[model samples]
Target chain A: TPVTVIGLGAMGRALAGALLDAGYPTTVWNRTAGRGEDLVARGATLAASPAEAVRAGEVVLVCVVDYAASQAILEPVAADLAGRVLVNVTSDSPERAREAAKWADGHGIRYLDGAVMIPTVMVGSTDALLFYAGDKSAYDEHEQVFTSLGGQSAYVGADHGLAAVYELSMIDFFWTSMSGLVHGYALAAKDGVPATSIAPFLKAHISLLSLLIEVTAKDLDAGEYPGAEGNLAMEVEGIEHILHAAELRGLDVSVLRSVRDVARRAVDLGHGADSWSATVEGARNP
Target chain B: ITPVTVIGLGAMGRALAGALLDAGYPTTVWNRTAGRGEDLVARGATLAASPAEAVRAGEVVLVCVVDYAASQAILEPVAADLAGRVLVNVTSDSPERAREAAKWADGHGIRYLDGAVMIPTVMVGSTDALLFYAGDKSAYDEHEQVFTSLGGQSAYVGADHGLAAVYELSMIDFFWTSMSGLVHGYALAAKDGVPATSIAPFLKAHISLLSLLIEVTAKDLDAGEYPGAEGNLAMEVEGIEHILHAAELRGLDVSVLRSVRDVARRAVDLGHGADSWSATVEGARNP
Candidate 1:
């Protein structure tokens, strides 16, 4: 099926380029006129307007800047958008995704909220992970076209908010984890250890984190945080040394302190003898 | 072949003792309270009566206790007997405490090497574990082979006794924060009806990005220049807002994102809006 990619941003252009590369009859559009020149040169039909773009293809892929811009662009062409499969790959909150899905339902458009998990460069590759959720039937209908944009396309569920929820949570993890690495490197650097010297070990350390994730998940699922492996009291003691090391180096311990607070709260609640997973209770309630 | 005495038969201490015995070294095991080393004793290891006896039974005395205080209490009583032996401390302690213990060892005419075990008890005997040591280089060279029996890899970090402790604590920082993020992500995925097993592969792929990040950020830090060629602090702080909004909608705790947002915003506030995430290191250092 022919696909229309609106919003010609870096990500949108990549999606359109990937479709064209895959020999899909691709239609490209942007609010600005000259943004699609290279795409047009590469045999992509540049749609003159949002309505034209909506009318141009069996599947309309929207990768706008935000949900508000998606609403503005689609609301103007809502009449044209009816009977078309609209895949909004824009990044937004779960609430915004649910709200947009409701708006699409009112307009009789087949809507699928998507979260592109990989970078633009990886859009056409097997490494790309595109998360989708909406009407399962609509997702099944365009599954072929969606998979054309990425290899690892997942139809999460019927709830349109699910994709955005996972996306946000994963991003939350990414940013926080990266912050921890930077903080660790800085602390190490303060002690005359260069980043290059510790880079390999830091990477290896991250690989070790994957093992902990499985352990923590099983503990959280069972609802029994046995400290058979490592308990909260030991963790609390361990983090104090971290805080001390950070403070001794004159670095900010805010991130470490924040995590320590959760552990401390669990300890205060008499769960210190429990496993570190016990702190997840505090995290859930906090 | 140097006989080694393993102090404090906790889970880790026991693993160290068992590994030494398996490697054909005469291992002497002891603890404040008995019964933790019965299996090791059954395997032809001697059970020492006290810390002093433990020190006297081996050329290398390995202390793997709970903390620095326990180590000090055990070693101080046996200080007179510790002369002419290598005291390799594998206990977890602060860098200051490690340095203090090193000084005490120096005063007692004992060779000292502070070590931090980078893997758990299960990986102790295999080549999968890493041991970080810092102290007198000559002492480390002499005992590096013995430490290798506990793990496949061992690094003599420096003459400063605190390097291993600082490295351990920083690794603890990296581990805990990354675990918090993974747990938060796993909880969110579960709420969305995604299985933990399915989420694991995606998370593993996401973690591979850190290798590239470490390389790039290392150069940026070395150069003292952070160019936002790919991403900037301004963009990150904006994304944090989206993360906060999504988390709040699901009634999940927003503390993680809020902490990250503060760090990102601090970088932007300090005129690093156009710089990469490495600029946050400066934010952490100065703030």
Candidate 2:
């Protein structure tokens, strides 16, 4: 069965090529008629219109820029989607994914909201992951097809929103930690210590990253940071040193300093013995 | 071939004992007059009737304790003669370590050096760490044998000062960077996830591949601009949006990545797009 791909953006083209190369009769269409010309040369059939594309394949893959773009193209061709599976690889909020799934269901379309977990070039390779949620029956049916484009295609949950939730949250943690490590090395370089000198030690200490999460997990579930093991008081003492080092180095540490001040205030308010998680209660809620 | 004695009943003291035992020294020691009796008696060292017995063992005596008060209770009696042998303290605190080293030196003792490092009790047997030292070199030479018990020791230049300066300040960066990972993970996990389990791949990326300073140094040495070798600034900006998506899912904002974003923006504004990604070099220097 041909997998019809709508949207020929960088990611969408990659997905279509993977399907076509895997011997699936890949039918493709794009806003710009000539967008899929290269794919056409690779034996992909170009659909005359969006409706024609949706009706041509059992699984219709949509990889537009966002939820709105995904809808703008799909909603107009809703009649052609009945009994067809619409797998959305576009990016969007979880709430939006859930709402879109409901809209798809009402129009008699089996919907699975997916978020590509790797970069565009990584599609169809061993180093890829695809996140999908909603319409389990449809997902199970096409799991083999999706795996062709990625190493592992994860079924997040029955709700269409789960894929979006996982995709966004996972990347957020990944990038922030990356940036923090960068900032630390940057500061160290100012001291004439080669980042390479600290790299091994930093890598070794990175394993301890999980210990921090384990502490946070308990604190979040309890909704309190009990500083019993090591309180904010000790942490404040440490932060004082961070502010001083950054100041001594003449680095703009406002972002780091702001967090230190907030935690320091929490300590001053008598939560000095509380766990570091206690700060979250005030910060996350407020 | 210098004889040295260590006094105390703490984990650090035990580490020193094990190191001395391995070093094959004529080591002797007293620990609150009660503990380590078997080790001391078996090691062929005579126990003193008072603090004087331990202090008189060698020209160098190391005292490890909870604080200076505990050290004083045990070392004060021998204080009069402490001027002859160098005293190396493995105790914590810049001020207190210096003061004790100074007091020991004032008695006409050989010299005093304050030392400390980040190592586990088990690490005392290996030569793998960089320890910090302050005070006097002659004192360090006399006590270098004892300091090597923990591992590699590096001397911090200056008075009996900056011992704690190195530790407290160094750990500030160490602890905060570690804590930032914790905070970001906490924000992430609160939205119903096990970051301990989920973060393995990401942590691997951090520990294995990315070394920002080395990445920057290559470009700086080559006199190239930021994003100089690989992906451009526009790509990083696009990547940031993907991150923001995840932050919002956990009901958090991308405040942390904004630091990088701000730097990248400044670099882009400076017309360094085609340069090395480390072109944000200007932003890193202390103005």
Candidate 3:
């Protein structure tokens, strides 16, 4: 099916380029004219206006900087969007996704919310993870078009906002873990351990974190964090050591201290003998 | 073979003693309380009655206790006897405490090699575990075999006794942060009715991505160049806002997201708004 890509940012151009590369008749538009020049050179038809772009394809793909930009482009041509499928791959909150879906519903537009989990370089490859959540039938209709842009195209649910929720939560995990890793590198470097020397070891340790995640998840689900192996008390002690080491190096210990504070709270609540997952309860309540 | 003494027969201590005994070292074990070293005793190990006697029994003493204070208490009275022998302290402690212990050992003429076991007791006797040591280069070279008897991998990091402890603590920092991120992911998924098992593959992939980021960020930091071509601080704060919104919808505490967002905001304020996530290291370093 033909596709129209509005808002030709880096991601938007990638989407349009992928569609054109995949042999789809692609129509591209943006607020500025020069952004679509490269796409037009590659067999993508440049649309004169947002409405012209909306009317150009059965599937209209929107990839802008944020939801507001997406709305600014789509709302001006809302009437032209009727009877067409508007797939919003823009990054935004779940609430914004739901609100957009609702607005599209009121305007007779078939809406599907999506999140591009991979970077732009992976946009046209099989490694791109594009998560979609919206009208089930609409997803089934454009499943092939979606898969053509990614590695794994997962239709998460029909809530229209689940995709954005997963996107934000997965990113939450990524940011937190990356911050920890970088901080760890700085700490190790301060103590005379070179980054290259510690990188392999750090990678090995990160592999172990997968096992830890699985184990902790199981205990969280079971609601019984067995302390037979390592407990909160033991973890608190370890964290204290980390705090002390970071403090001695004059690096910020807030991240480690936050985790330790949660563990300490769990222990103070008489869960000292429970596994470290017990502290998740404190996180949950706090 | 050089005989080894293990003080404080806790789980880790017992594991060390058993490894030494199995490796054909004459191992002497002692604990403040009884009933822990019977298995080691049965396996051709001699159980010392006191810390002082344990110190006297072997040429190299291995201390794997609860903390540095425990190790200090057990060894202080035997400081006079410890002058000639090497003390391989595998006990966990802060780097400051480890440095102090090294100082005390130096004053007493005891060769000290502070070590941190990177693996648990279960992998103690196997080649799967790693041991990190720092201090007294000649002492480490002399006793490398003794440490290797417990784990196949042993690295003598530096002459600073605190290096091993610092490495251990830094690892702890990584472990705790990654664990918290993972747990938060699991909680969010559970709220969405996703099974814990289903998220495992996704998380495994995510962790691999983290490893890649670490490699890239390391190079960037080394060169003092950060390209904002991908995710920037401004972009991160936006994603964090979405995360906060999702957590609020589920009635979950948004502390983790809030903390991450605050860091990104600070990076933006510090004129790294267009820089990649690697610039956050500057925030941590300056903080």
Candidate 4:
């Protein structure tokens, strides 16, 4: 049960400490000093260099700043990394994860691309979700160690990039929704509602979105969107109030205006009578 | 069962009446113009001759007209009839407008409660339906059973007459904004020749995550401390750039993302680059 973590960022430190807490022989390295002081005090070994960390590697978790940082750290230690298991939990694109897997393969290293799906604050608890892709037996070998990082150490597939695929998709929703929420804060603030007051209502809205996702996902699969309940045309006109509401208050309307324009285009493309899901056609085509 | 009167016959109003009738409440239905509630009339419901006549028919009168203006026109002449009765206005309108109706009803001794239906017509009669009521807690408490006859989750927020509209429009804002992100994702998936159903499963998980984020943010904003020990504006900006680049390659409309990235930049510029996305609310607040 020897483990090495390459990188001492918030996530990387958590990964190592969680493994160390599991009573594994843990070694960790970061380009900068002073981060792993607490971890070292807790019986973890702080490596002087990435190569030294790689040498301690039975199950090496490489979760640096990003994929590029990991590439920079690992290439020099490529020889040392060979014949050792590497789990790259750094967040990035599926394409980049694929490249990392390919690079790891070229060096005769056993590789698994991984993604942390929760905040580092919960990194060690069962609440954390860690995703892995690529080798199966390698995951099974370190499955308990991964579970220490999170409860469900989900192995997505043999495709090394699949983990990041879910990561990217989830990030897409997260980042955009955050943007939407902040803009909402501005709108509600202008309307004399504080962010604190609006949060619960926003949550109620999120519950509504759950139903939308459940219903529309079926429509997307069938490629038949029924508009009898609500159509794109109603939406095209319905958003006018939100825009006008924002405009009167001097809030940024670009995002919503553009959203309206997209829906308008969908209607113009003759999907006026089609359901809101039909707007996806304009989106994909435009 | 308490006798209930519904004073509008639009699709939503009809559904409201239909639900009351289905619940076996003695239901009275009326519209400015007739012929909209024949089904209700056929289902042992009384078709009121006028708004005044409708007002006299029930102790709890529900109005779902197009706007507050239409509602006022329909109910003002019948104000005396509505006096001492619970006037629950579920019409779609602004918070201030709801408060105004509350004031007008107060002057007439009309126990007023502003209700906002959170779902469309088809689902109105079911237990899955949701309705929020504000103002005159006594009215809501007295007729809570009758109000819930139309829906299951009938919530009484407070005595502030506008809270229902506040909640409604707030959710409306969240709906459209998040819907933009959703359709954008669907579009991108379609561009990749992937069916949306393929991504829906993933999106459902994403929605659950967002629900959790909303809860965290509520606490963060309330406590006046936003911890970005994890994801921050700096990270969000880079992620936005990645999406922008990907969408740009395919000639897709990512103006929503562009606006979002702009907010991220604004927050980063405001010395919150290292702060959680909660800090971005400050950017929104300022601009």
DockQ of each: 0.59, 0.19, 0.56, 0.42
The sequence of per-residue lDDT tens digits that candidate 1 reaches over residues A134-194 is: 9788888877777878888888788898888668767777888888888888888888888
Considering DockQ, where higher is better, how would the candidates rank from best to worst?
1, 3, 4, 2
What tens-digit string does per-residue lDDT give for candidate 2 at B1-287? Answer: 77777777476676766677777767777777576656645755545555676677777777777566676666676777675777766765544446655765666654776666455455565666445566776777656666676565444545635434444344335546445545555565456554434533433333333344334444352343344434455555565665555555456544545665666566667776666445554454422
What is the C-alpha lDDT profile of model 4 across B264-287, one tens digit per residue?
788789899888888877766555
Q: Whose lDDT is greatest here? A: 1
> Scoring model 3 with DockQ, what do you get?
0.56
lDDT of 1 by residue, B11-67 (tens): 999999989988899999899987899999999899998889999998999999988
lDDT of 4: 0.79
Query: What ranges in model 1 sit over 4 Å off?
Result: B189-198
lDDT agreement of model 1 with the native: 0.82
Give i-RMS (Å) per prediction: 1.8, 4.5, 1.9, 2.5
TM-score, one value per model: 0.95, 0.70, 0.92, 0.89
* Residue range A1-286, candidate 3, lDDT tens digits: 9899988888898998888878999999889779988888899999888899889999999888765666777898899999989998888877788999999999999999998877776787876778899988888988889988885778888898888767766776787887787788788888677766666666546656767877887887888788876778988887776777777788876777777776777788788999878876776776
Candidate 4 lDDT tens digits, A142-247: 8888888888567878888677655554565567776677666667666556667666555546667877876766776777788787678988877876777667
Hey, what RMSD does candidate 2 come out at?
A: 6.4
Residue range with the least summed lDDT across 10 consecutive positions in model 2 chain A = A201-210
Which lDDT value does model 2 have at B199? 36
